[PDB]
Design a protein around this ligand. Structure first.
Ligand SMILES: CSCC[C@H](N)COP(=O)(O)OC[C@H]1O[C@@H](N2C=NC3=C(N)NC=NC32)[C@H](O)[C@@H]1O
Length: 492
């Protein structure tokens, strides 16, 4: 039972959440849900990145104060994430008292530890000015040892080299008023650059969670230098520099633990290209939900995700085909083709023994490889394994052919045994997919009259009453895709 703290990058409070953002949150949520299923203590945290000149000026435009804009954006963002069932334990803000205090705490520890430097510069002004710099170069060797301690992704362990080929430099962490952010203590008119306080927002968000829980020990247990808890950050490749260099260094110099690992993913493309507004492929999370459910996109992204930083393509044509073929035709089909005979002919009661014990064992035997696949973030591998098992289950059902055994008077016991077998195979499959399809899983659990646990598959449902269900998952069609695209064009 490990203690794990997982985060997703903090979305900027200056735009709506789109399908690109959703790849990140969905990848993280699936991993998080899997970890909870295995019994670990998990804390999934996020928050809006609310500081920076851009935001300050955007607020001025709309005639709304930044405080007002970020407040509205925060609600919009959380409504969308909740719509995709992203299970955060806390969603906070970089513009909070918790983050203000932690930013000052870290800065003061850095300055006192001698990692903060001063200087002057020239810049366009609507001119000189003093600035504060973080002495990154002093943590190089430490970063080296940390970087090579068999942890980060190969493509990431490398990449940084191209950055070393340019040498680490002191980082300008201060900005002048007017600026929407935190004021630097003992330095009037100076503010912390957004990127300095942003990652501290991870800490601010957890502190908020602990404070709300009345938990006065967890914060330190997770962030103290000798913590045995694991810290993971899910991020895109465009912000790896901040998370692999500045961030670890800031923590090291302020007597805090560094991330256990960074899980970097690639960009989402639609129909093979970057999202395009004119083509209606720049899709908002809110818009997606007007047309499709969350499970469909969660499934599609998961079937294509891996432990690498490669781009993920949402091919709209392929989307409809994949969802109907896998979810409806393979998994859900296993339940619907068998539940009828059970509910109608046997009052919903499943057989008292497994018809084919060998087949069931083949299914539960796969838990190890599938669980390891979720754990290692090889989602595509996990899905292929699960769908391969599903093919086996549908083959079993065909060989046994219940639709024929049913019309043969005197074969009741045989029918119940066959159809119950299929229902139990379905139980196992939905357990492996539980991290991926939250809503379909709830519908399956209501039908099975059972909550699905990872260890529970070792005990099949016997002499057990199932409930009649009304379509667990309906097929989708290209006309809905066309409508989604058309709507997205019309929005911009
Ligand atoms: C302390 S972390 C601070 C992060 C900063 N506010 C960036 O915010 P934002 O630009 O909203 O990006 C949030 C995450 O969304 C990811 N993505 C943004 N557009 C994306 C795609 N098109 N595809 C995949 N991920 C995307 C980014 O890589 C990033 O990790």
């Amino acid at each position: 039972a490990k203690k794990i703290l997982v985060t997703c990058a903090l979305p900027y409070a200056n735009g709506s959440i789109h399908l690109g953002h959703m790849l990140e949150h969905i990848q993280a949520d699936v991993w998080v849900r899997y970890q909870r299923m295995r019994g670990h203590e998990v804390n999934f945290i996020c928050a809006d990145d609310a500081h920076g000149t851009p935001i300050m000026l955007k607020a001025q435009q709309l005639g709304i104060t930044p405080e007002q804009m970020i407040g509205e954006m925060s609600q919009e963002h959380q409504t969308d994430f909740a719509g995709f069932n992203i299970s955060y334990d806390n969603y906070h803000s970089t513009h909070s008292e918790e983050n203000r205090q932690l930013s000052e705490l870290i800065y003061s520890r850095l300055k006192e530890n001698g990692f903060i430097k001063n200087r002057t510069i020239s810049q366009l002004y609507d001119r000189d000015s003093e600035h504060f710099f973080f002495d990154l170069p002093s943590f190089s060797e430490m970063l080296q040892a940390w970087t090579r301690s068999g942890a980060l992704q190969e493509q990431v362990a490398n990449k940084m080299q191209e950055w070393f080929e340019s040498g680490l430099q002191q980082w300008d962490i201060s900005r002048d008023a007017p600026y929407f952010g935190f004021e630097i203590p003992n330095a009037p008119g100076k503010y912390f650059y957004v990127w300095l306080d942003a990652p501290i927002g991870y800490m601010g968000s957890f502190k908020n969670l602990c404070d709300k829980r009345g938990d006065s020990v967890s914060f330190d247990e997770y962030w103290k230098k000798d913590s045995t808890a694991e810290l993971y950050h899910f991020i895109g490749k465009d912000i790896v520099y901040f998370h692999s260099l500045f961030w670890p260094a800031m923590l090291e110099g302020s007597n805090f633990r560094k991330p256990s690992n960074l899980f970097v993913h690639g960009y989402v493309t639609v129909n093979g290209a970057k999202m395009s507004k004119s083509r209606g492929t720049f899709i908002k999370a809110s818009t997606w939900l007007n047309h499709f459910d969350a499970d469909s996109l969660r499934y599609y992204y998961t079937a294509k995700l891996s432990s690498r930083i490669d781009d993920i393509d949402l091919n709209l044509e392929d989307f409809v085909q994949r969802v109907n073929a896998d979810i409806v035709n393979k998994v859900v089909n296993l339940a619907s083709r068998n539940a009828g005979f059970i509910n109608k002919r046997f009052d919903g009661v499943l057989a008292s023994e497994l018809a084919d014990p060998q087949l069931y064992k083949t299914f539960t035997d796969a838990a190890e490889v599938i669980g390891e696949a979720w754990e290692s973030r090889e989602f595509g591998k996990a899905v292929r394994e699960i769908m391969a098992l599903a093919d086996l289950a549908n083959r079993y059902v065909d060989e046994q052919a219940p639709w024929v055994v049913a019309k043969q008077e005197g074969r009741d016991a045989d029918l119940q045994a066959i159809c119950s077998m299929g229902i139990n195979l379905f139980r196992v499959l939905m357990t492996y997919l539980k991290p991926v399809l939250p809503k379909l899983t709830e519908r399956a659990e209501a039908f099975l009259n059972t909550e699905l646990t990872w260890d529970g598959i070792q005990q099949p449902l016997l002499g057990h009453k199932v409930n009649p269900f009304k379509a667990l998952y309906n097929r989708i069609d290209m006309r809905q895709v066309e409508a989604l695209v058309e709507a997205s064009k019309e929005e911009v």
